[PDB]
Amino acid sequence: KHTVRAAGAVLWRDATVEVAVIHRPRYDDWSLPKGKLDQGETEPVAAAREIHEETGHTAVLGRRLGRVTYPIPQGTKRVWYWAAKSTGGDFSPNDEVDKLVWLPVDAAMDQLQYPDDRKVLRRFVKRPVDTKTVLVVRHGTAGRRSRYKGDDRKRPLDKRGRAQAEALVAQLMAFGATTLYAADRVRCHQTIEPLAQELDQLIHNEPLLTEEAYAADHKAARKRLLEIAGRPGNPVICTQGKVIPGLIEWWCERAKVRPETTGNRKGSTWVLSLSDGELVGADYLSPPDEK
Ligand SMILES: Nc1ncnc2c1ncn2[C@@H]1O[C@H](COP(=O)(O)OP(=O)(O)OP(=O)(O)O)[C@@H](O)[C@H]1O
Ligand SMILES: Nc1ncnc2c1ncn2[C@@H]1O[C@H](COP(=O)(O)OP(=O)(O)OP(=O)(O)O)[C@@H](O)[C@H]1O
Ligand SMILES: [Mg+2]
């Protein structure tokens, strides 16, 4: 009943792609790279780290590919998997991973010994993998709304929320975030300011994506989400709890995309995978300091 949290990846390069399959001497197994989350990592951060450590490759994460669980003496191991596009590197054999083979999917399917790995690979080929990514982030914890009407424009992140913001840097960088947007509320800007410092980039202010604006004019909000998503790069858009569910649900509904997980917590992230402008995945990631 105790859960050991882990993450891994289908690491690919180039139907036309090759995927990485590893061998480990300790188990004599052929599998997909994965590993346990360290203290304070989220799944995407651990996936990217483990890919680097076990294969030698840096990568950009894309679509999430489901969850595998299996029993271990400690209880239950849970592994969430991502598609990860290689951005270079070289494997060197060691005592932990002595071989790495790059294989087309069909031969990878035969090489992989665990039925659960084969299911992850089936998910991987179900949809495009050369995707662009929009990251929709609910701002971090910011104390409690006041007694006043509507919204407190300037209410800042609290101590927990500032730490969420710092913890979102690595998570959002795991997906190759390049450009930054925040609704016209101080708490939304503050959530992505650590990432803004990291990238040395400006945050574009988005008055059409605040709670008040969405309630006044939801079509303008939807149109602006698509405008942003259409630009080159992988945008991060930080907004509010009354806005996100509605935008996500509308997009999923119209593109017939089924999210495997649901939520709307402060500090959470929706990873929206796009192929030639079409939505092909919608993956809800918990806040960095929650399970
Ligand atoms: N996908 C799977 N389904 C069922 N059993 C598995 C699976 N993957 C590994 N195992 C088995 O469970 C045991 C532990 O393997 P696991 O890969 O979880 O160990 P590990 O050394 O902690 O690796 P990691 O650090 O990569 O999470 C091994 O005997 C292995 O064969
Ligand atoms: N005075 C209020 N007026 C309207 N809605 C409120 C008020 N207080 C709380 N809420 C509702 O509760 C939710 C969370 O309120 P809370 O004070 O915890 O967070 P918040 O930082 O304003 O969140 P968000 O910016 O995502 O709405 C809001 O999204 C809103 O739906
Ligand atoms: Mg491992």
Q: Which residue shows structure tokens 């604006």? A: 213
- Name the binding residues for substrate: 24-27, 29, 34-36, 70, 77, 96, 114
Concatenate the DSSP letters of all residues of 124-182 into one string: HHHS-SS-EEEEEEE--------SSSS--TTPPP-HHHHHHHHHHHHHHHHTT--EEEE
Method of structure determination: X-ray
User: Cβ(4) to ligand 1 under 6 A?
Assistant: no
**Does the CB atom of residue 242 touch ligand 2 within 6 A?**
yes
Q: Which residues are annotated as part of the binding site for Mg(2+)?
A: 34, 50, 54, 96
Taking the CA of residue 117 as reference, the ligand 1 atom at the shortest distance is 1
Encoded tokens for 230: 């259409």
- Sign of the Cα pseudo-torsion (71, 76, 77, 83, in order): positive
β-bridge mates for residue 31, sequence order: 22
Q: In what order do the strands lie in the sheet with 269-275?
A: 203-206, 179-183, 235-239, 132-138, 269-275, 278-285
CA of 167 to the centre of ligand 1 (A): 28
- C-alpha span between 76 and 31 (Å, rounded): 18
CA 20-25-28 angle, to 5 degrees, is 80
152 φ/ψ angles, rounded to the nearest 5 degrees: -95, 105
- Show the DSSP H helices in the chain as ranges: 43-55, 105-111, 115-126, 159-174, 186-199, 211-216, 218-230, 244-255
CB 72, CB 34: distance < 8 Å:
no
| CA-wise closest residue to 111 among 15, 9, 20, 7 | 20
Residues 6 or more apart whose Cβ sits within 8 Å of residue 226: none
Q: Which residue owns the Cα nearest ligand 1 atom 13? A: 72
CB-based burial label for 239 (10 Å; 0-12, 13-18, 19+) = buried
211 CB within 6 A, ligand 2? yes
Q: Is 109 left (phi over 0), alpha (psi -120 to 50) or beta?
A: alpha
DSSP secondary structure code for residue 25 in this structure: T
Nearest ligand (C-alpha, residue 37):
1
Task: Identify the DSSP state of 118.
Answer: H
- Residue 4 falls in which region: left (phi positive, over 0), alpha (psi -120 to 50) or beta: beta
SS3 87: strand
Which of 122, 163, 118 lies closest to 140, judged by CA? 163
Cα 211–214–216 angle (5° rounding)? 110
Residues linked to residue 103 through DSSP beta bridges, in sequence order: 19
DSSP secondary structure letter of residue 100: E
Atom number of ligand 1 nearest to Cα 6: 27
- CB atoms near residue 9 (< 10 Å): 31
240 close to ligand 2 (CB < 6 Angstrom):
yes
